[PDB]
Enzyme design. Structure first.
Site, short mmCIF file in Angstrom:
data_model
loop_
_atom_site.label_atom_id
_atom_site.label_comp_id
_atom_site.label_asym_id
_atom_site.label_seq_id
_atom_site.Cartn_x
_atom_site.Cartn_y
_atom_site.Cartn_z
N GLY A 20 0.82 -1.22 0.00
CA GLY A 20 0.00 0.00 0.00
C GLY A 20 0.84 1.24 0.00
O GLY A 20 2.02 1.21 0.33
N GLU A 21 0.24 2.36 -0.40
CA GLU A 21 0.96 3.58 -0.53
C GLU A 21 0.05 4.69 0.02
O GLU A 21 -1.17 4.66 -0.20
CB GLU A 21 1.21 3.83 -2.01
CG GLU A 21 2.25 4.88 -2.29
CD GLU A 21 2.86 4.75 -3.68
OE1 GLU A 21 3.35 5.78 -4.15
OE2 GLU A 21 2.85 3.62 -4.28
N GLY A 22 0.65 5.60 0.78
CA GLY A 22 -0.05 6.80 1.27
C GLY A 22 0.81 8.03 1.14
O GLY A 22 1.92 7.98 0.63
N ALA A 23 0.28 9.18 1.58
CA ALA A 23 1.10 10.38 1.57
C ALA A 23 2.37 10.24 2.46
O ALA A 23 3.39 10.84 2.16
CB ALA A 23 0.27 11.59 1.99
N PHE A 24 2.27 9.42 3.51
CA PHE A 24 3.41 9.15 4.45
C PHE A 24 4.57 8.41 3.80
O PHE A 24 5.69 8.47 4.30
CB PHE A 24 2.95 8.37 5.69
CG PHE A 24 2.65 6.91 5.38
CD1 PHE A 24 3.66 5.96 5.36
CD2 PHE A 24 1.36 6.53 5.03
CE1 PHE A 24 3.39 4.66 5.01
CE2 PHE A 24 1.08 5.20 4.66
CZ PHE A 24 2.12 4.27 4.67
N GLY A 25 4.29 7.66 2.73
CA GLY A 25 5.26 6.71 2.20
C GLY A 25 4.54 5.48 1.73
O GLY A 25 3.48 5.55 1.10
N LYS A 26 5.12 4.32 2.05
CA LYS A 26 4.56 3.04 1.60
C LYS A 26 4.79 1.90 2.56
O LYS A 26 5.60 2.00 3.46
CB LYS A 26 5.04 2.64 0.22
CG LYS A 26 6.47 2.47 0.04
CD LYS A 26 6.77 2.24 -1.49
CE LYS A 26 6.47 3.45 -2.37
NZ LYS A 26 6.62 3.25 -3.85
N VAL A 27 4.03 0.84 2.38
CA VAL A 27 4.21 -0.40 3.09
C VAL A 27 4.60 -1.44 2.05
O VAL A 27 3.86 -1.63 1.06
CB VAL A 27 2.96 -0.89 3.87
CG1 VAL A 27 3.34 -2.11 4.70
CG2 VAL A 27 2.42 0.21 4.77
N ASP A 140 -6.75 5.30 18.21
CA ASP A 140 -7.14 5.28 16.78
C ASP A 140 -7.53 3.90 16.36
O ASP A 140 -7.13 3.41 15.30
CB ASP A 140 -6.04 5.87 15.93
CG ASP A 140 -6.49 6.20 14.51
OD1 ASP A 140 -7.69 6.34 14.27
OD2 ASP A 140 -5.60 6.30 13.66
C1 LIG Z 1 2.71 -1.18 8.80
N1 LIG Z 1 1.26 -1.44 9.00
C2 LIG Z 1 0.56 -0.25 9.52
C3 LIG Z 1 0.84 0.99 8.75
C4 LIG Z 1 -0.20 2.08 8.95
N2 LIG Z 1 -1.48 1.73 8.33
C5 LIG Z 1 -2.59 1.28 9.19
C6 LIG Z 1 -1.64 1.80 7.00
O1 LIG Z 1 -0.73 2.19 6.26
C7 LIG Z 1 -2.91 1.23 6.43
O2 LIG Z 1 -2.70 0.75 5.07
C8 LIG Z 1 -1.92 -0.39 4.93
C9 LIG Z 1 -1.37 -1.09 5.98
C10 LIG Z 1 -0.60 -2.23 5.73
C11 LIG Z 1 -0.41 -2.66 4.42
C12 LIG Z 1 -0.96 -1.96 3.36
C13 LIG Z 1 -1.70 -0.81 3.61
O3 LIG Z 1 -2.17 0.00 2.62
C14 LIG Z 1 -3.56 -0.11 2.28
C15 LIG Z 1 -3.89 -1.47 1.72
C16 LIG Z 1 -5.34 -1.51 1.33
O4 LIG Z 1 -5.57 -0.48 0.37
C17 LIG Z 1 -5.38 0.79 0.98
C18 LIG Z 1 -3.94 1.01 1.34
N3 LIG Z 1 0.03 -2.84 6.83
C19 LIG Z 1 0.49 -4.12 6.99
N4 LIG Z 1 0.25 -5.01 6.00
C20 LIG Z 1 0.82 -6.22 6.18
N5 LIG Z 1 1.56 -6.65 7.18
C21 LIG Z 1 1.75 -5.73 8.16
N6 LIG Z 1 2.45 -5.90 9.31
C22 LIG Z 1 2.34 -4.74 10.04
C23 LIG Z 1 1.57 -3.83 9.38
C24 LIG Z 1 1.23 -4.45 8.13
C25 LIG Z 1 1.06 -2.54 9.93
#
Ligand SMILES: CN1CCCN(C)C(=O)COc2cc(ccc2OC2CCOCC2)Nc2ncnc3[nH]cc(c23)C1
Ligand code: NA
EC number: 2.7.12.1
Length: 333
Positions: A20-27, A140
């Site tokens: 995923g991607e946001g204004a903060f960066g990406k995951v 939150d």
């Molecule tokens: C680091 N992570 C919390 C970060 C903060 N937070 C809640 C977000 O950024 C929410 O959005 C996503 C979180 C994500 C993966 C993709 C995301 O992007 C979405 C996907 C759906 O389409 C919209 C954008 N986290 C995770 N995924 C998989 N494994 C993980 N382990 C820990 C995290 C995480 C938590």
């Protein structure tokens, strides 16, 4: 940074996908070669004024929770490591699956089955109670911040919606996103929570602490049961009107004490139930028990717990220690 699949961070982490991607960066999802090929998630946060504080704060909270509970036994996300990286802060976590929000959305906003709600509710309560036991409030909680441990799923064709539908093999969750979490002895921001999950004491600027998390959980659980967010508004007065529709009138003391006078007239919400907005609220929201989809005992039990969580007065609201003993959870034990 581009983070194409195949790029490597700090020698050990090979990017395999962007989650995923946001204004903060990406995951991103990475293979951690140092740890034997375990896949991990890396939150790559721009190290700039807008985003850095939440990243640094989460890291401190999770270091503390990891010290207290090194094997991550209370359903909270496990941070594995963090590092500085070319103008970003990278936070490495255990890899999880889609969020509970993501799942409902990908399934056309169909709600969860009651048996899965029971298990997920218990795990959320257990996780957040752990935080409450450690002088922390999450602030939150929302479906986007509750992630399934695994996304693996079985698929049946569902003739009622005329398509294949996925059912998770395992509804275990973790609570994520500790970037807003606040210790008892720390500065409390005036405004906390995502609007739809925000407690009345927050809206009214009455002070908040652990109980505001319990309100958010109540909001989450009813959304799991219905598939839709119960307070869909950006307007605070309308939000309070929606609360009153679902839950009855606000406690008079809360209305009297708030400095948010603009919401009230003669210590009642300043709201015309028959205006266009009032008519909308009347149709969008209904008294809580009218949302029940069955009168089975277990549905009654869930709604009893939800009502206790959505108590207006945070001093009277059920605690998560009490919630974990609620009869709705008996079938798990
Ligand atoms: C680091 N992570 C919390 C970060 C903060 N937070 C809640 C977000 O950024 C929410 O959005 C996503 C979180 C994500 C993966 C993709 C995301 O992007 C979405 C996907 C759906 O389409 C919209 C954008 N986290 C995770 N995924 C998989 N494994 C993980 N382990 C820990 C995290 C995480 C938590
Ligand atoms: Na039960």
């Amino acid at each position: 940074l581009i983070c194409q699949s195949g790029d490597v961070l700090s020698a050990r982490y090979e990017i395999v996908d962007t989650l995923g991607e946001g204004a903060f960066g990406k995951v991103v999802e990475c293979i951690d070669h140092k740890a034997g090929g375990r896949h991990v998630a890396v939150k790559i946060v721009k190290n700039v004024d807008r985003y850095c504080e939440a990243a640094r704060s989460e890291i401190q909270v999770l270091e503390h929770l990891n010290t207290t509970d090194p094997n991550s036994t209370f359903r909270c996300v496990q941070m594995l490591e963090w590092f500085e990286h070319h103008g970003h802060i990278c936070i490495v976590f255990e890899l999880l699956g889609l969020s509970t929000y993501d799942f409902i959305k990908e399934n056309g906003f169909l709600p969860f089955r009651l048996d899965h709600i029971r298990k997920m509710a218990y795990q959320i309560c257990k996780s957040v109670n752990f935080l409450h036991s450690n002088k922390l409030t999450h602030t939150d909680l929302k479906p986007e911040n509750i992630l399934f441990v695994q996304s693996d799923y079985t698929e049946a064709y569902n003739p009622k919606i005329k398509r294949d539908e996925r059912t998770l093999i395992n509804p275990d969750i973790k609570v994520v996103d500790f970037g807003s979490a606040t210790y008892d002895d720390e500065h409390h921001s005036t405004l906390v929570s995502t609007r739809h999950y925000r407690a009345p004491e927050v809206i009214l600027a009455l002070g908040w602490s652990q109980p505001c998390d319990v309100w958010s959980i109540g909001c989450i659980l009813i959304e799991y049961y219905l598939g839709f967010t119960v307070f869909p508004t950006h307007d605070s007065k309308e939000h309070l009107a929606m609360m009153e529709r679902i839950l009855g009138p606000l406690p008079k003391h809360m209305i009297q004490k708030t400095r948010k006078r603009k919401y009230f007239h003669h210590d009642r919400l300043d709201w015309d139930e028959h205006s266009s907005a009032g008519r909308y609220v009347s149709r969008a929201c209904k008294p809580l028990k009218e949302f029940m989809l069955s009168q089975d005992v277990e549905h009654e039990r869930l709604f009893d717990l939800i009502q206790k969580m959505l108590e207006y007065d945070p001093a009277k609201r059920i605690t998560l220690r009490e919630a974990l003993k609620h009869p709705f959870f008996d079938l798990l034990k």
